[PDB]
Amino acid sequence: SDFDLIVVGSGLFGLTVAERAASQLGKKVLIVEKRSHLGGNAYSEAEPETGIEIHKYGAHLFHTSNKRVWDYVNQFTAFTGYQHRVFAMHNGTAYQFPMGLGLINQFFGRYYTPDEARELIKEQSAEIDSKDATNLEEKAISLIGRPLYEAFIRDYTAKQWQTDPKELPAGNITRLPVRYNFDNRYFNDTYEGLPVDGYAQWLSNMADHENIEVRLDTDWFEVREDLRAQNPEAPVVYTGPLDRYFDYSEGHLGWRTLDFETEVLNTGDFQGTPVMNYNDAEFPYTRIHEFRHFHPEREDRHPKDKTVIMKEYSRFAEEGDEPYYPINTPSDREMLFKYRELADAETESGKVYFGGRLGTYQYLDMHMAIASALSMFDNKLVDAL
Amino acid sequence: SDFDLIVVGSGLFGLTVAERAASQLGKKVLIVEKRSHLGGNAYSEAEPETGIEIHKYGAHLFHTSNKRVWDYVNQFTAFTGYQHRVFAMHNGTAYQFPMGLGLINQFFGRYYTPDEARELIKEQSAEIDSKDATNLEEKAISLIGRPLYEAFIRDYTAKQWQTDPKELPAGNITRLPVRYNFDNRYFNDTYEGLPVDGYAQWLSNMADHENIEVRLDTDWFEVREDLRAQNPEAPVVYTGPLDRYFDYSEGHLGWRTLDFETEVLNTGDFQGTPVMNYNDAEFPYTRIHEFRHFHPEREDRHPKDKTVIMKEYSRFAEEGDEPYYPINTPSDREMLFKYRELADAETESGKVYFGGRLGTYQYLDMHMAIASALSMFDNKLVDALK
Ligand SMILES: Cc1cc2nc3c(=O)[nH]c(=O)nc-3n(C[C@H](O)[C@H](O)[C@H](O)COP(=O)(O)OP(=O)(O)OC[C@H]3O[C@@H](n4cnc5c(N)ncnc54)[C@H](O)[C@@H]3O)c2cc1C
Ligand SMILES: Cc1cc2nc3c(=O)[nH]c(=O)nc-3n(C[C@H](O)[C@H](O)[C@H](O)COP(=O)(O)OP(=O)(O)OC[C@H]3O[C@@H](n4cnc5c(N)ncnc54)[C@H](O)[C@@H]3O)c2cc1C
Ligand SMILES: O=c1ccn([C@@H]2O[C@H](COP(=O)(O)OP(=O)(O)O)[C@@H](O)[C@H]2O)c(=O)[nH]1
Ligand SMILES: O=c1ccn([C@@H]2O[C@H](COP(=O)(O)OP(=O)(O)O)[C@@H](O)[C@H]2O)c(=O)[nH]1
Numbered sequence: 001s002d003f004d005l006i007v008v009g010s011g012l013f014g015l016t017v018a019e020r021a022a023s024q025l026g027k028k029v030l031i032v033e034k035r036s037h038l039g040g041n042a043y044s045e046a047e048p049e050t051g052i053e054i055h056k057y058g059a060h061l062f063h064t065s066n067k068r069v070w071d072y073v074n075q076f077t078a079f080t081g082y083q084h085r086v087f088a089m090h091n092g093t094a095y096q097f098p099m100g101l102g103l104i105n106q107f108f109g110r111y112y113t114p115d116e117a118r119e120l121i122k123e124q125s126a127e128i129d130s131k132d133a134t135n136l137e138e139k140a141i142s143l144i145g146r147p148l149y150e151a152f153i154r155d156y157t158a159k160q161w162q163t164d165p166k167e168l169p170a171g172n173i174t175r176l177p178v179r180y181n182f183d184n185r186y187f188n189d190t191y192e193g194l195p196v197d198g199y200a201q202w203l204s205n206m207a208d209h210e211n212i213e214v215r216l217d218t219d220w221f222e223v224r225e226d227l228r229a230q231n232p233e234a235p236v237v238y239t240g241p242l243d244r245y246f247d248y249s250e251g252h253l254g255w256r257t258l259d260f261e262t263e264v265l266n267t268g269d270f271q272g273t274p275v276m277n278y279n280d281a282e283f284p285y286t287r288i289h290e291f292r293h294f295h296p297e298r299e300d301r302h303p304k305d306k307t308v309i310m311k312e313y314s315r316f317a318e319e320g321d322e323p324y325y326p327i328n329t330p331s332d333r334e335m336l337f338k339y340r341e342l343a344d345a346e347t348e349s350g351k352v353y354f355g356g357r358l359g360t361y362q363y364l365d366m367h368m369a370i371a372s373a374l375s376m377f378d379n380k381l382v383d384a385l
Numbered sequence: 386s387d388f389d390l391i392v393v394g395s396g397l398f399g400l401t402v403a404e405r406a407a408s409q410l411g412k413k414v415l416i417v418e419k420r421s422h423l424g425g426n427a428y429s430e431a432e433p434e435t436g437i438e439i440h441k442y443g444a445h446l447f448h449t450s451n452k453r454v455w456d457y458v459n460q461f462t463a464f465t466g467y468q469h470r471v472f473a474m475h476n477g478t479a480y481q482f483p484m485g486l487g488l489i490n491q492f493f494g495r496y497y498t499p500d501e502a503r504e505l506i507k508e509q510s511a512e513i514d515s516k517d518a519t520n521l522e523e524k525a526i527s528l529i530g531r532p533l534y535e536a537f538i539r540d541y542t543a544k545q546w547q548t549d550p551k552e553l554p555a556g557n558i559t560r561l562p563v564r565y566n567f568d569n570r571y572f573n574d575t576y577e578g579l580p581v582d583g584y585a586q587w588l589s590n591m592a593d594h595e596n597i598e599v600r601l602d603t604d605w606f607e608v609r610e611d612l613r614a615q616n617p618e619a620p621v622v623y624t625g626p627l628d629r630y631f632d633y634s635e636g637h638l639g640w641r642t643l644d645f646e647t648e649v650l651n652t653g654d655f656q657g658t659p660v661m662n663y664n665d666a667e668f669p670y671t672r673i674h675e676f677r678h679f680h681p682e683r684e685d686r687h688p689k690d691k692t693v694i695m696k697e698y699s700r701f702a703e704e705g706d707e708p709y710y711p712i713n714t715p716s717d718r719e720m721l722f723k724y725r726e727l728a729d730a731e732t733e734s735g736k737v738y739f740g741g742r743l744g745t746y747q748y749l750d751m752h753m754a755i756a757s758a759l760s761m762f763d764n765k766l767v768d769a770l771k
Contacts, residue, residue, distance in 0.1 A: 081466070087567060094486065094496045094567070101479065101657045106491060111479045114654040181657030181678070182472060182479070269499040272486045272566030293566075 003231050004385060005029040008220045009239035011040025012366050013356030015206045016072075016373035017237050017381065022211035024377075025385050030234075031207070032223065033216045039203035041324070042366060046198075049264050051301065052291045052308045053198050058258060058324070059275060059289050060199060063192035064367035070191040073370065077202035079193030080297060084186045088152055088277045097152070097277065098186065099144045100179040107148065114180045121145045137165035140173045155281040160314045161256060167329045172363070189367075194294060235384050237376070239356030241323055242339050245346075250338040253361055254331075255323030259313040261285075268305045285311040326361045336361055353380060388415045388616040389770060393605040394624035396425025397751055398741035400591040401457075401758035402622050402766060407596040409762075410770055414596060415612070417603045419625075424588035426709070427751060432693045434649050436686065437677050438583050443643055443697060443709070444660055444674045445584060448577035449752035453759065455576045462587035464578030465682055469571040473537055473662045481569050482537070482662065483561040484529045488569075492533065499565045506530045506565075524555035528563045540666040545699045546641065552714040557748065574752075579679055620769045622761070624741035626708055627724050635723040638746055639716075640708035644698040646670075653690050654678075670696040711746045721746050738765060 004027035007018045015038075018029045037043050041057040061084045064070055073079075088097035096102030104120070105111045112120055124145030133139035136157065141149045153173070157165050177188040195202040207214055220240065228236065238245060243253040274293040278285055289310040292302045317323045326332070339361075343354045355376055357364040364372065389412035392399045399416060400423070406412040422428050426442035446469045449455055458464075473482035481487030489497050489505070497505055509530025518524040521542065525534045538558065542550050562573045580587040592599050600608075605625065613621075623630060628638040659678040663670060674695040677687050702708040711717070724746070728739045740761055742749040749757070 085567075089496065092495045094490050096481070096487070102481070105479050110477045111474065114657045115652055181654060182470075183657075267500055269566060272499045272568075 001231055001233075003028050003030045003234045005237070005381075006228065006231070006234045007031040007237045007239070009033065009040065009237075009356065009358075010035075010038045010203075010207065010214060010216075011239055011356060011369070012042055012203075013359070013364075013369040013373045014040070014237065014239045015203065016370050017355070017377050018212055019206050019209060020374070020377040021381060021385065022209040025382070026211065027385055028211045029213075031212065031214050032218050032220050032227075033214060034219050036217055037200070038207055038214060038216070039199065041322075042199050042203055044199035047262075047264070047291070047308045050292075050303050050306050050308055053295060053298075054262070054291050054308065054310070055199070055289070056260065057322075058260070058312070059294075060366065061187075061192070062194065062366055063187040063189040064371075065190040066367060066371055067190075069367050069370050069374065072374070073202075076205040078196040079191075080196055080295070082194045082294065082296075083192065084275075085184055085273070086186045086275050086277055087273055088279050089283075090151060090279045094276070095152070096184050098176045098178065098184070099148060100184055101182050102184055103148070103152075107151065117180050121148075124148075133170050135166050135170055136168035136172050139170035140165075143173065143178045152279050156277065156279045156286060158281065159284070159286050161327065162314070162316060163327060163329065167331075169328050169363075235381070236350075236352045237381075238352055238354055239359045241358045242343065242354065242361050243335070245354075246339060246342050249342070251335050253335060253339075254327035254329060255317035255321075256314055256325040256327060257317040257321035258324050259315070261311045261313070263309050263311070265307050265309060266305065268303070268307060270307050270309050285313050287312050323358060326357075326363055328361070328363070351384070386616045386618055388413050388619050390414045390622070390766070391612060391616065391619050392416045392622045392624070394418065394425065394741065394743075395420075395423035395588075395592065395599060395601075396624055396741055396754065397427055397588075398744070398754040398758045399622065399624045400424070400588060401755050402740070402762050403597055404591050404594060405759070405762040406766060406770060407594040410767065412596060412770055414598070415616075415619075416592065416597065416599045417605050417608065417612070418599060418601045419604045421601055422585075423592055423599055423601065424584060425624075427584050427588060429584035432647075432649065432676075435677075435688050435691050435693055437688075437693045438680060438683075439647065439676050439693060439695070440584065440674070440679075441645075443645070444676075444679070445751070446572075446577070446679075447579065447751055448572040448574040449756075450575040451752055451756050452575075454752045454756050457759065458587075458755065461590040463581040464576075465581055465680070467579050467679065467681075468577060469660075470569055470658070471571045471660050471662055472658055473664050474668075475536055475664045479661065480537070483563070483569070483571065484533060485564045485569050486567045488533070488537075492536065502565050506533075509533075518555055520551045520555055521553035521557050522550035525550075525558040528558065537664050541662065541664045541671060543666065544669075544671050546712065547699070547701065548639070548712060548714060552716075554713045554748070560748075620736040620738065620766065622738045622740055622766070624739075624744040626743045627721075627728065627739065627746045630739075631724060631727050634727070636720050638720055638724070639712035639714060640702035640706075641699055641710040641712060642702040642706040643709045644700065646696045646698070647693065648695075649691060649693050651691060653688070653692060655692050655694050670698050672697050708743060711742070711748055713746070713748070717746075736769065738769075 005021050007014045010031050010033040018031050021027045021029050042060050044053050044055050047054050086097050088095040095106050101117055104117050125142055128138045128142045130142045133142045140153045161168055270290050276288045292307050346352050390406045392403045395416050395418040403414045403416050406414050427445050429438050429440045432439050471482050473480045480491050489502050509532055510527050513523050513527045515527040518527040525538045546553055655675050660672055660674055662672045677692050731737045741754055
């Protein structure tokens with residue numbers, strides 16, 4: 001008892017809202033986490049044989065242009081100067097990526113100036129304007145033209161979504177920078193880097209406040225009925241799956257899940273870069289991570305003749321999988337609305353708020369989760385405390 | 386005796402020694418600069434029509450792994466987070482550069498793995514071991530193999546030096562990182578970036594001390610007899626050309642000089658990157674600079690539909706020219722040794738010290754000029770000014 005707030009989930013959304021209540025409002029918070037560790041998908045740990053820091057839940061690369069979010073996270077960890085770059089493997093060649101003069105030179109066979117390249121892509125993309133694009137395929141072609149779409153977007157998306165590119169959200173592809181220069185940074189944000197002391201350390205520092213206690217290995221849906229009887233005093237922030245909150249009363253929301261197969265190899269360097277995208281259908285995995293390259297400043301502590309790689313696979317979320325991505329087909333989006341009604345209803349009736357990637361069925365990055373958490377705290381939780 | 390110290394030349398070397406005497410030893414310093422501005426080849430200024438900062442003596446990019454140098458320069462200017470990357474234009478294609486998996490893929494036509502690339506380059510470099518490579522051609526081939534050498538080094542080098550690569554220093558090519566991964570940073574140093582407020586501001590801050598007076602438009606060899614009458618006590622640090630100092634007694638050292646064509650173009654972006662190398666003999670210039678891409682953090686101040694470029698041309702230094710590079714052929718290294726002897730004698734006899742790219746005939750980057758000057762101040766001038 002004595003708890004002012006209950007947060008369901010110790011992911012970044014759950015941790016920010018809890019940390020803000022604790023240090024800004026001085027309220028005692030308890031976070032209920034189902035897993036054996038803090039941090040949700042942002043969690044990382046060292047690989048036993050090599051000591052290399054692994055994102056066991058997918059490559060986690062922090063980037064933001066939100067100054068307020070940047071200053072905030074920098075309270076809990078320093079960040080390296082790492083800048084994410086991705087190469088795209090297609091028909092036996094590693095391509096500069098995303099769209100820029102480098103990829104354009106490599107794929108079309110000669111150098112195009114910025115002006116010449118703008119003209120080239122204008123021609124190949126003419127079949128649809130960006131204003132008229134309502135899904136992933138129309139939008140992609142509109143931004144990068146037909147041939148680049150068919151060569152670098154089609155098969156990849158098929159593997160990542162196993163879904164008709166004509167019903168997936170346009171916003172999925174606008175995640176990637178589209179450029180007419182040689183800049184091949186995978187993100188275009190003001191601030192980015194990796195936690196200097198690793199993710200795990202970062203996330204713990206966040207939860208480290210004395211008005212916060214974490215109960216790991218604990219399922220909310222089990223302990224809720226008494227715990228909030230022990231404390232009808234505390235509001236609840238739920239960052240678990242939405243459709244699961246209401247026991248699939250309206251059905252199952254479409255989610256994608258990922259699998260990670262880790263391999264320790266007898267070479268110091270497998271692919272010479274942190275992430276290689278596999279854009280061809282013949283390769284079952286979407287990309288390969290080589291984690292030693294995420295921290296070149298730890299070179300002296302990495303083994304000289306071993307490396308850990310991880311092949312990443314995508315499939316539909318089955319019950320028992322962690323959902324990683326919302327699919328948000330139009331068919332999905334309807335079901336989503338019905339749950340939103342229910343959700344709205346629950347927050348007033350039962351003082352339960354719905355946040356985070358899983359809580360709102362939204363394709364959120366870390367900095368987006370944190371911003372959305374900051375918004376909920378300032379706009380809602382300040383009142384209800 | 387209005388001056389405890391006289392410095393010839395206001396390049397980074399000269400500004401460093403002057404600033405240290407001024408702030409660390411409380412000594413009055415005179416810097417004689419021959420040019421109309423201070424800072425030597427690191428000088429920059431805004432282009433009138435566009436306002437874009439131009440490095441007027443060739444693109445200047447600061448990089449170092451020397452922590453003492455880094456902390457020092459950061460007293461006079463902050464630096465951006467910019468990282469230099471260079472692309473190499475060859476047979477109508479812009480290649481990732483210097484050697485990495487990117488260049489190897491593009492030039493050889495398929496992806497090579499790090500291990501495969503190591504084996505591929507091991508084969509192509511078999512004709513010479515790096516241990517036995519004693520000139521530029523041998524060293525380049527030993528490091529990146531014959532085919533990459535002939536496509537990306539030979540012709541560029543020909544334009545830039547106009548000298549048999551078998552007579553050029555091996556050290557010229559080892560300036561470039563040789564990698565078996567996808568990292569295409571042109572430098573591999575711990576610290577790098579651009580002066581946030583430009584080079585001119587940085588260099589002015591260095592010279593901005595009440596113990597320092599700068600005389601521009603002044604040639605040391607013309608004012609020398611008078612200046613050394615009015616302050617016969619003061620040591621002199623000379624950072625001008627070594628062989629000119631002794632009136633070419635031992636002959637002419639080989640030097641290269643540069644010429645630049647600067648052009649304002651009616652487009653917002655000419656080449657999508659700050660430096661494009663032109664590795665083919667068919668282009669008379671060695672590279673093209675597009676200065677706006679050095680400062681993307683100034684995007685809001687850049688014109689939307691204009692850009693300034695600069696084409697760089699190389700030739701031998703003749704009597705009217707400022708020398709930009711030492712050539713250091715074996716014949717040059719002989720002559721140099723003789724000038725070193727003279728210089729040594731002069732330092733004893735006339736208390737004249739010799740420093741910097743021109744003063745010592747060395748292929749020095751900015752951080753090396755500054756490192757060598759910090760060293761000279763501590764190790765020679767503290768003593769000499771006691
Ligand atoms: C493969 C992948 C790569 C990514 N890469 C990046 C990137 O490069 N850069 C970036 O900025 N973002 C990235 N992200 C996004 C980032 O992982 C998430 O957006 C962020 O973690 C979202 O925060 P969240 O709190 O909403 O989600 P979550 O981390 O999923 O929070 C859920 C937590 O609540 C717990 N929980 C669920 N149900 C219960 C329950 N019933 N009881 C108790 N606890 C429960 C879960 O165990 C989990 O720990 C990536 C995501 C993935 C999947
Ligand atoms: C095209 C080019 C690009 C370069 N790019 C980089 C880079 O990207 N990064 C990097 O770290 N370094 C770079 N450098 C190297 C850089 O220029 C040198 O490190 C630096 O200029 C050396 O400083 P310095 O003081 O020793 O010599 P200088 O800069 O040559 O200074 C010598 C000064 O002495 C003056 N002087 C000569 N004679 C007299 C006289 N008789 N009387 C009075 N004054 C005289 C000269 O006018 C000059 O101002 C580049 C050089 C060139 C040519
Ligand atoms: O090589 C690529 C990279 C991305 N995408 C598309 O762009 C979306 C977002 O890409 P991101 O790299 O942002 O995927 P995440 O890291 O979020 O899984 C993916 O879902 C794909 O549909 C693609 O088709 N090919
Ligand atoms: O595309 C290139 C780049 C460099 N070099 C060789 O490497 C030396 C050093 O190159 P840098 O880029 O350091 O030249 P700087 O910028 O000092 O003129 C040059 O003199 C050439 O001999 C070359 O042959 N081709």
